Amino acid sequence: QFLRTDDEVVLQCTATIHKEQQKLCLAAEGFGNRLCFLESTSVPPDLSICTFVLEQSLSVRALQEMLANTVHRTLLYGHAILLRHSYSGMYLCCLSTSLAFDVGLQEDTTGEACWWTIHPASKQRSEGEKVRVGDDLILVSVSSERYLHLSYGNSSWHVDAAFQQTLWSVAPI
């Protein structure tokens, strides 16, 4: 089992504090300020808000060539991806509003803000390799060079684009 474009997925991270551990999924709504946040899972109470389609997977080189010119494929490590929030129709985006930027939903995909390069968690996954289901991914914003990051804010968990990694688990569902 490899991750394929058009695959419907959820993104999960593990959150640990004070000897208590839980898994969270990346969530969004297409109403309000469209900012991302995280659901606790028991299986998320509300699955629809956590659902994403892997629309596109392009090499950084191909994506930059494409943007420069304007002025069911398997996922490979090092490639840039586009994540469509399935319910809203919009796209997971690195936003220009506050170290960390916010992560949220955007309509247009022209530009780099909506693109995320996938990186290996360990030293035994390699650039250009097929991404397995079960692999822990690292996601980096093409526009801002920041990671999709798990953050412990006030007494809760948040998601932003920051200078430190978070391992994400992308499973079909």
What resolution, expressed in A, was reported for this entry? 2.5
If you search the block for the tokens 């803000």, which residue do you land on? 113
Conformation bin of residue 6: beta by default, left when phi > 0, alpha when psi is -120 to 50: left
Give the span between the Cα atoms of 93 and 84, in whole angstroms: 10
Query: Domain-by-domain residue ranges, the chain?
Result: 1-173
Q: What does CATH list as the number for 1-173?
A: 2.80.10.50
Conformation bin of residue 145: beta by default, left when phi > 0, alpha when psi is -120 to 50: left
Which pair of tokens denotes residue 137?
């991914």
94 contacts 113 by C-beta, under 8 angstroms: yes
If you search the block for the tokens 């506050």, which residue do you land on? 98
Give the span between the Cα atoms of 60 and 53, in whole angstroms: 20
What one-letter code names the amino acid at 5? T
Cα 123 to chain centroid, rounded: 21
Give the span between the Cα atoms of 90 and 103, in whole angstroms: 13
C-alpha angle with apex 40: 35 to 41, nearest 5 degrees? 130
The β-bridge partners of 53 are 8, 84
Which pair of tokens denotes residue 164?
């430190």
